């Protein structure tokens, strides 16, 4: 173990969806149906169960019913399969050209007909997209497809950095995980689980800031938990602890300690944003009682996502949690 986990700022206790065991059973079955287990070259069933994405989603989406949790869990099974698949098939061989082609096919499985799927990533996305889109607005649809594409562009950017040996500097790292990282995608599914953000406030600064603080915080937390795997097994350079470490030339523990202080700070700004800036713009735009409740449902969702996410990271076999 390369460093000891720091003292985390954890103000709000996590809650756990009672449909957890339902989500587990369904998603493991769905994974095999998509071809993500034996024969994938990526996961065996034992891997998927040890990662425990049912537990992740039950922690991060505590209030939705059994069917919603099952769909969300499949989404996360898919997003992590895509991550480990891309690593195993393209990153470890630094196959930038084949990676590009792989990624270029995936938008064909998010129509705003579809081709036949040739791999589990394509198969999973096709399935999820058809199951999810009918329940949401046409506007959520366009935003969610964009968010999913950003995730895809992220893998490319990361691979190119690995291939050229270039670690991003601290501002570059943050801005890149903001622009193409998976926080808007996660927040996209929080809306599915809670309510879509009223368009009257969706593009305003306080909701933008709310997303910035949410994004920074979730990535920095994961960086702390996955540094060991990423640095001494994967060769992944997209990690905040590694970014500070190379920039300052400090010890691993020193960088993790500062990363965590940055994390606590982002969490502070989230709380302030959620409590003050967002309610203010809700008044300024004259949202109805119903619209205000949707906003509150969503921001509350982000809070529970973060608290649950930490409890998951402390348990999943993906991470440095002893």
Applying CB under 6 A, which residues contact ligand 212?
Answer: 79-80, 83, 182, 222, 226, 318
Eight-state DSSP code of residue 65: -
Give the number of residues written for the chain: 322
Name which of 79 and 244 has its Cβ closer to ligand 212: 79
Residue number with the smallest Cβ distance to ligand 212: 226
Tokens of 148: 């999913």
User: What is the closest distance, in whole angstroms, from the C-beta atom of residue 77 to Mg ion in the complex?
Assistant: 14
User: What is the closest distance, in whole angstroms, from the C-beta atom of residue 150 to ligand 212 in the complex?
Assistant: 12
Residue 164, annotated as binding a ligand: no
Residue 88, annotated as binding a ligand: yes
User: What is the closest distance, in whole angstroms, from the C-beta atom of residue 167 to ligand 212 in the complex?
Assistant: 15
Is 47 a binding residue for Mg ion by CB under 5 A? The answer is no
Neighbouring residues of 278: CB distance < 8 A, sequence distance ≥ 6: 201, 206, 207, 210, 295, 299
The partner in contact with residue 79, picked from ligand 212, Mg ion, none with C-beta cut-offs of 5 to 8 angstroms by kind, is: ligand 212
Name which of 152 and 209 has its Cβ closer to Mg ion: 152
Name which of 61 and 219 has its Cβ closer to Mg ion: 219
Give the torsion through C-alpha atoms of 238, 239, 243, 249, to 10 deg: -130
User: What is the closest distance, in whole angstroms, from the C-beta atom of residue 301 to Mg ion in the complex?
Assistant: 22
Q: Which residue has the tokens 């369904």?
A: 26
Residue 257, annotated as binding a ligand: no
User: What is the closest distance, in whole angstroms, from the C-beta atom of residue 187 to ligand 212 in the complex?
Assistant: 14
Residue 39 burial class via C-beta count within 10 angstroms: exposed 0-12, middle 13-18, buried 19 and up: exposed
CA atoms within 13 A on the CB side of 43: 27
Q: Is 169 helix (H, G, I), strand (E, B) or coil?
A: coil
User: What is the closest distance, in whole angstroms, from the C-beta atom of residue 222 to ligand 212 in the complex?
Assistant: 4
Can you say whether the dihedral through the CA atoms of 222, 227, 228, 233 is positive or negative? Answer: positive
Eight-state DSSP code of residue 38: T
Is 83 a binding residue for Mg ion by CB under 5 A? The answer is yes
Is 226 a binding residue for Mg ion by CB under 5 A? The answer is yes
Name which of 85 and 143 has its Cβ closer to Mg ion: 85
Name which of 178 and 300 has its Cβ closer to ligand 212: 178
Binding-site size, Mg ion (CB under 5 A): 3
User: What is the closest distance, in whole angstroms, from the C-beta atom of residue 181 to ligand 212 in the complex?
Assistant: 7
Name which of 150 and 285 has its Cβ closer to ligand 212: 150
Q: Are 131 and 190 in contact (CB under 8 A)?
A: no
How far is it, in rounded angstroms, from Cα 219 to Cα 315?
17
Which of residues 73, 148, 213, 222 is near Mg ion by CB under 5 A?
222
**CA-closest candidate to residue 121, choices 77, 71, 72, 81:** 81
Query: Taking contact as CB under 5 A, which single stretch among the options 19-27, 193-201, 222-230, 251-259 is the one that binds Mg ion?
Result: 222-230
Positions in 259-278 near Mg ion (CB under 5 A): none
The partner in contact with residue 124, picked from ligand 212, Mg ion, none with C-beta cut-offs of 5 to 8 angstroms by kind, is: none
Please give the full DSSP string across 80-137, using - where no structure is assigned: HHHHHHHIIIIITTT-HHHHHHHHHHGGGG---------SHHHHHHHHHHHHHGGGS-
Name which of 22 and 84 has its Cβ closer to Mg ion: 84
Please give the full DSSP string across 187-229, using - where no structure is assigned: HHHHHHHS-PPPHHHHTSHHHHHHHHHHHHHHHHHHHHHHHHH
Q: Which positions make up the binding site for Mg(2+)?
A: 83, 88, 260, 264, 269
What are the residues binding Mg ion (CB under 5 A)? 83, 222, 226
Q: Which positions make up the binding site?
A: 83, 88, 260, 264, 269
């Amino acid at each position: 173990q390369p460093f000891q986990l720091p003292h985390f700022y954890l103000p709000h206790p996590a809650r756990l969806n009672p449909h957890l065991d339902e989500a587990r059973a369904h998603s493991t079955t769905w994974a095999r149906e998509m071809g993500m287990l034996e024969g994938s070259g990526v996961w065996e069933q034992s891997d998927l169960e040890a990662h425990d994405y049912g537990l992740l989603c039950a922690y991060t989406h505590p209030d939705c019913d059994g069917p919603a949790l099952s769909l969300i869990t499949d989404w996360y099974v898919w997003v992590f399969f895509f991550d480990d698949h891309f690593l195993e098939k393209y990153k470890r061989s630094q196959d930038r050209l084949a990676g590009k082609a792989h990624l270029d096919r995936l938008p064909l499985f998010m129509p705003l007909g579809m081709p036949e799927p040739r791999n589990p990533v394509e198969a999973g996305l096709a399935d999820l997209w058809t199951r999810t889109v009918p329940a949401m607005s046409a506007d959520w649809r366009r935003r969610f497809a964009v968010a999913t594409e950003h995730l895809l562009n992220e893998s490319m950017w990361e691979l190119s950095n690995i291939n050229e040996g270039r670690v991003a500097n601290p501002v570059e790292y943050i801005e890149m995980r903001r622009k193409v990282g998976g926080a808007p995608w996660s927040a996209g599914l929080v809306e599915y689980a809670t309510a879509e953000v009223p368009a009257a406030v969706a593009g305003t600064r306080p909701l933008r800031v709310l997303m910035e603080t949410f994004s920074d915080a979730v990535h920095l937390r994961n960086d702390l938990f996955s540094y060991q795997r990423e640095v001494e097994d994967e060769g992944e350079l997209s990690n905040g602890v590694l970014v500070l470490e190379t920039f300052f030339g400090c010890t691993t523990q020193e960088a993790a300690d500062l990363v965590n202080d940055v994390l606590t700070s982002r969490l502070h700004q989230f709380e302030h944003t959620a409590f003050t800036e967002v309610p203010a713009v809700a008044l300024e735009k004259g949202l109805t009682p119903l619209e205000v409740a949707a906003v509150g449902a969503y921001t509350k969702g982000l809070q529970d996502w973060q608290s649950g996410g930490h409890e998951w990271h402390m348990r999943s076999s993906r991470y440095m949690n002893k």
